[PDB]
Amino acid sequence: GSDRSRFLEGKRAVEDKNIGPLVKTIMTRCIQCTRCIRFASEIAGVDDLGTTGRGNDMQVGTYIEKMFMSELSGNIIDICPVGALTSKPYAFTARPWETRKTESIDVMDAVGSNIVVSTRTGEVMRILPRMHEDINEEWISDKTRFAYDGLKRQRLTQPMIRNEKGLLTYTTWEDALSRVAGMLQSFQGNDVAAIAGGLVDAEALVALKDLLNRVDSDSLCTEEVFPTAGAGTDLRSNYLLNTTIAGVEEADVILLVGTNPRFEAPLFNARIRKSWLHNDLKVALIGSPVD
């Protein structure tokens, strides 16, 4: 690129737009590369972005005011090469040269999306998508991205006990572990149980399983239900997506039963989006008709 301009005339200016509380539009910065449009109508499947007008004053907007609804809307931020489309929550919060990037995964969806966690001064600002092909590929769904502030909402940071009246009052570790220990050595078997949550680490799952077993108990329940009858958890293929989503493109006809993947596994649908677009997949789902 050059080091100066021969430009001495004026620059065109276009008004902003409001298509979301996440995407922020400074459309004077737009270079009309049409990446958002092709992303919207080929990856997210929503045909609402476009370039209205011609000549030079045309705008890559939406004409009629719109509310960008796609669950892959957050990736529109990472594809625009300029600051024309930007993440509203992260806007004016950090600059790239100070954000230490750590590669991690997602837990919001059961795809384990490879993501980049931006960290600065003991806190996280914005979440970026990594690349692994079978996992999230190059895009992540919205709530995977705009969830950092959740870590800044209600936080459990101290041990808790019921006080003399019951009221939850902050306490040291000693009282917390002493309280559990007294009722842990007592009681046995089905008396001591465990219910698994949504975001539970495999390291913690083993630790609970060992702890519950060392006190002679097997009641480690889980949130969602899967019939133990027949084979249950015994056979690995019962509870596994054995087809390795990277192989869904290889498939020809998809049969989705009792699910809304566009809302449950957006990236899994995003694979179908890509696969069906190029590999000509034949989709068929029974259940409630949801887009």
Binding site: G10, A13, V14, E15, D16, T28
Partner: protein, 96 residues
Amino acid sequence: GVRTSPTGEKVTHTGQAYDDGDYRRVRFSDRQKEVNENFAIDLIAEQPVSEVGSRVISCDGGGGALGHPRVYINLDKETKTGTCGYCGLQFRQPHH
């Protein structure tokens, strides 16, 4: 424009307010809190809004090179009167 906290600590524009239990407030006792009374948040609420008329305004920030990198502001959203991001000065069209 400044508002006074219950403990008397004048809050700054960022909104910082050491509460009663914040032990670090002792740094302020026997001393004075430093607050810029001129609150840049409200110095544009009263600023006059320019009735310059054209589809695009060249906002340079006044003082020529002493202002901010000059930007072109578009006046087509009649709902929102255009503001220079650098400046905060408020510009509106003469009803298009």
